[PDB]
């Protein structure tokens, strides 16, 4: 109650501007020659990769 305490405050905001600040996004493994789903950096679909 009288000992020093360190404080950090984080604030965020949005407005009419590009985000340019985003968190991590993880990548799974790569499989081939099987009818599979895919999400390749924003495009989604189903098919066979060769």
């Amino acid at each position: 109650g009288h000992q020093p305490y360190r404080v950090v405050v984080l604030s965020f905001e949005l407005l009419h501007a590009p985000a340019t600040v985003c968190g991590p996004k993880k990548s799974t493994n790569l499989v081939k020659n099987k009818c599979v789903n895919f999400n390749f950096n924003g495009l989604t679909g189903t098919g066979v990769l060769t």
Binding site: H16, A17, P18, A19
Partner: protein, 39 residues
């Protein structure tokens, strides 16, 4: 695009497409532009 030009005055005839270099996420309104030189 940076392309060789024959020894000539006027702009040459032909096609040369321009590949992109960069896009920047700035979001500032633009109305005028200038140019800079080295002296």
């Amino acid at each position: 695009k940076h392309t060789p030009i024959n020894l000539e005055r006027d702009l040459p005839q032909g096609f040369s497409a321009l590949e992109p270099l960069v896009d920047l996420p700035i979001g500032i309104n633009i109305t005028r532009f200038q140019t800079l030189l080295a002296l």
